[PDB]
Amino acid sequence: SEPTFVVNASLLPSKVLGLQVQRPQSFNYQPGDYLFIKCPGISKFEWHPFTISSAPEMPDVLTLHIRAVGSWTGKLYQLIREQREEWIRSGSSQSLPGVPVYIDGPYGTPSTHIFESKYAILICAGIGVTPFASILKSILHRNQQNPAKMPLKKVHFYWLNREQKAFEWFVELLSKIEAEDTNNLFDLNLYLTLITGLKSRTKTGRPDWEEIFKDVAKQHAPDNVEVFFCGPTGLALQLRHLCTKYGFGYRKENF
Ligand SMILES: Cc1cc2nc3c(=O)[nH]c(=O)nc-3n(C[C@H](O)[C@H](O)[C@H](O)COP(=O)(O)OP(=O)(O)OC[C@H]3O[C@@H](n4cnc5c(N)ncnc54)[C@H](O)[C@@H]3O)c2cc1C
């Protein structure tokens, strides 16, 4: 527990909160880490886990991207909306109040092992992108400072969304990767289930995972490929079968 503050927030399509949280002097994390958060204004007692969508190289704030999907996220959305509307109407004398919260973390995920892999597939659906958002930014910081120091040779990125407007959560970051990725570390793939106004053609329908895995296996054999997944369990079963078929690294993270 650290008592800290939501100092700012963005209201992004598909009811998502781009929260900025004052980072305590002590709080070190790695990309892929999550924390538990308590907002006394919503519940004195409930803790909910959220991925840190920021990279730890950002120095005074952490970011969380939280989608309104039920009771507690709905209430935090409504609280942040209303506080922000009240400021449009008044919002003058002092600066933005700041919502008090408690944070517990960081907690680790096997996704952090990407930095020690040669070849990685990152697959995410909807807000499932957030740990991969942290990791992509961190790769950009680590490259402008130490391209030799890193053994990650290729990153295959697959991000699925039911709703086109959801790509806006991280379209800037994806733009910057298209800009700065002269050495083609990344292969970005956006599926609606260019169109992002990116140099990446937004694809449509369920990806052909069999065909993608076959291709990635031909590119990297006989070396090890690590699959990292953040999304629904029905997809996980399919990905797990394919990981066995082509000899890829899988972590069971879906039950
Ligand atoms: C490591 C980790 C990282 C996460 N990172 C993020 C992140 O970066 N961003 C993010 O937005 N979320 C993230 N989540 C999800 C998040 O932690 C929240 O608890 C959850 O997403 C919302 O809680 P809630 O009270 O708002 O919703 P709830 O009210 O719990 O509802 C959740 C879902 O379950 C359904 N549901 C509720 N009650 C029932 C019932 N009785 N029967 C059937 N269905 C029901 C709801 O309809 C809804 O679809 C993460 C989770 C973990 C474990």
Ligand SMILES: NC(=O)c1nn(C[C@H](O)Cn2c3ccccc3c3ccccc32)c(=O)c2ccccc12
């Ligand atoms: N690997 C994890 O830390 C982790 N992973 N999973 C599978 C999920 O990947 C974690 N996770 C979710 C689990 C359920 C719903 C949304 C999410 C989610 C949204 C964005 C980023 C991560 C998300 C868990 O269910 C889980 C549950 C309790 C504690 C940790 C986890």
